[PDB]
Design a protein around this nucleic acid. Sequence first.
DNA 1: CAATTATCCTGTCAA
DNA 2: TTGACAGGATAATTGT
Lengths: 56, 56
Amino acid sequence: PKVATNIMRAWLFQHLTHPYPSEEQKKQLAQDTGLTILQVNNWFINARRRIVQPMI
Amino acid sequence: KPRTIYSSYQLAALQRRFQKAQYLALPERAELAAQLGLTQTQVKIWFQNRRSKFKK
DNA sequence: CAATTATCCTGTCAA
DNA sequence: TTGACAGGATAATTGT
């Protein structure tokens, strides 16, 4: 899994506010890192709470 | 589409409004939402979202 | 207006 | 000390 992430996080300053990525924009963030498209929505919706949530 | 989080609060100003009124037209929609920011068709649905559960 | 198809959000435990 | 699936809740789609 390593460094299939900081790519995701380094851009994440872009849609920090709005994890409402386009359905085919999941692809250009998927395939470039790839793996099952279903697994990728999940990783971005198992991290809204890891931080920022306590940061309030 | 997509799901569109409304979704702060926002909300349960409605949940009694449904208890008050299962009907409205255009004219309220300004202060009803323009002071709240969201679009028209975002919520013309939302009663229709809640004419169930149940509502036998 | 009922029926659909697309969503995430949580809520069940795991190398 | 982080990542997978079923569950139960929800907002759009859409056309007899």
